[PDB]
Amino acid sequence: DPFTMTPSEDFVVTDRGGIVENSHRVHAAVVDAKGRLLYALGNPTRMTLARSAAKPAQALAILETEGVAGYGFDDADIALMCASHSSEDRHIARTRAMLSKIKAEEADLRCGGHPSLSEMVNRSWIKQDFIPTAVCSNCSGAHVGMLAGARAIGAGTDGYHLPDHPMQGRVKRTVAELCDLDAGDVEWGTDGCNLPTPAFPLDRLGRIYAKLASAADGSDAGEGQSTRCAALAHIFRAMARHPEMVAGEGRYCTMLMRAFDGALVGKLGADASYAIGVRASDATRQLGTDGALGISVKIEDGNLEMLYAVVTELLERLGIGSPDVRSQLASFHHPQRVNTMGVTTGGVSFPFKLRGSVDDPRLAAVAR
């Protein structure tokens, strides 16, 4: 019944010859530069671990640490602070160059190695029986930035990653401030790279990224800016200018940001969250806001292949980009379902319904 559809029915589904294989619940928020909710799927306020989708907030805390500017991190270094990189040789090399800029060593890192986020890099490592180490961590840039901050303020470096350290006090405050939340409304766990990692309502992830894009707009327009807004504009510009530092070759975030050529930034969170900050455009105005826009998505069960398909579908439905811009992402939008003998056996479909405009006022939209 098309007239009784509900947020609990917002799914992405794979089929085999039209027979349902898997289904995945979708949550999404689309917000303006103040965080006002414009459009949604599922539960737009779902309490959600942002994971590395919070890295730009961490980068901001680093860049606002007094004395960090003296180290001379450049835009590519800052993009690496914002990264979940593929551990390509260029990422490892930039991590080492950033350590050198602060006169630290790999032994000062408190993150550990892991298999690469890139299948092609992992393949090279397997052939050499290479064991990744701290300097290969997908989060190495943020860890180097945290060490830089710890050094700059005269804190110890030994536990820069622990919650009682002033660098982590700074991160925690910065995250809550960007979300416009009280500290008690942000919860904290520990991430795979051994840093505190925040959870907050999903819409507030979109709010962070709307603020990034909004700051980019104000900077480009030559408006006088607070030190925080200037830093948020710098982070936006760094990510958009060096999107390969943020992820790597063949990675969704890199292909997405290259396709849009400065119009937006986007960032993956592990276990299938995604955040996009969209600069003001004809598209955002058609969506009904006079400023920048933020988008946040979570696939409830954590499937990344479905995440990229859903994010690309949502961009198409919001009219963000051109068919030509978004077709650089076609392999993520409609994932290949081809068996071992070259036969297409099924596909992906998007039975979810954006809400925010039409329905009978007696239709309840219960966030679920």
Residues in the site for ligand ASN, rule: CB under 6 A?
51-52, 84, 138-139, 191-193, 269-270
341 contributes a contact to a copy of itself by CB under 8 A: yes
Among positions 267-286, residues that touch a copy of itself (CB under 8 A) are 271-272
Closest CA to 98 of 149, 47, 64: 149
Q: Which residue is nearest to ligand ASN (CB)?
A: 192
Q: Which of 126, 183, 330, 363 binds a copy of itself (CB under 8 A)?
A: 126
Nearer to a copy of itself, 25 or 267 (CB): 25
CB 221: neighbour CB atoms within 10 A?
Answer: 9
10 binds a copy of itself (CB under 8 A): no
* 192: contact with a copy of itself by CB under 8 A: yes
**Which of a copy of itself, ligand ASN, none does 332 bind, CB closer than 5 to 8 A by kind?**
none
> Which of a copy of itself, ligand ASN, none interacts with 52 (beta carbon under 5 to 8 A by kind)?
ligand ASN
Q: Which does 184 bind (CB under 5 to 8 A by kind): a copy of itself, ligand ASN, none?
A: none
Burial of 103 (0-12, 13-18, 19+ CB in 10 A): exposed
CB of 326: closest distance to ligand ASN in angstroms? 24
Amino acid symbol at 127 = K
Query: Which amino acid makes up residue 218?
Result: G
> Which amino acid appears at position 281 of this protein?
S
Pick from 187, 223, 261, 359: which binds a copy of itself (CB under 8 A)? 187
Is the Cβ–Cβ distance between 368 and 8 less than 8 Å?
yes
Residue 107 contacts a copy of itself per CB under 8 A: no
Q: Is 191 in the site for a copy of itself (CB under 8 A)?
A: yes
Residue closer to ligand ASN by CB (options 208, 270) is 270
Calpha distance 22→353 (Å, rounded): 18
Q: Are 196 and 175 in contact (CB under 8 A)?
A: no
- C-alpha pair distances (Å), 320 with each of 25, 144, 232, 325: 23, 34, 22, 9
**Three-class SS state of 293:** strand
Q: Which residues pair with 16 in a beta bridge?
A: 19, 346
Partner that binds at residue 110, options a copy of itself, ligand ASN, none, CB closer than 5 to 8 Å by kind: a copy of itself
Give yes or no for residue 310 binding a copy of itself (CB under 8 A).
no
The answer to the question of residue 43 lying near a copy of itself (CB under 8 A) is no
Q: Report the residue from 189, 288, 319, 351 that binds a copy of itself according to the rule CB under 8 A.
A: 189
The beta-strand segments (E) located in 159-304 are: 187-190, 196-201, 264-269, 273-278, 293-299
Three-class DSSP category at 197: strand
- Is the Cβ–Cβ distance between 298 and 202 less than 8 Å? yes
Segment lying near a copy of itself (by CB under 8 A), choices 86-94, 104-112, 203-211, 353-361: 104-112
CB nearer to a copy of itself: give 39 or 188: 188
The smaller minimum CB distance to a copy of itself, of residues 70 and 115, is found at 115
What letter does residue 222 receive in the DSSP assignment? Answer: T
Q: 192 is written with which tokens?
A: 């795979």
Distance CA 167, CA 339 (A): 50
Interface with a copy of itself includes 186 (CB under 8 A)? no
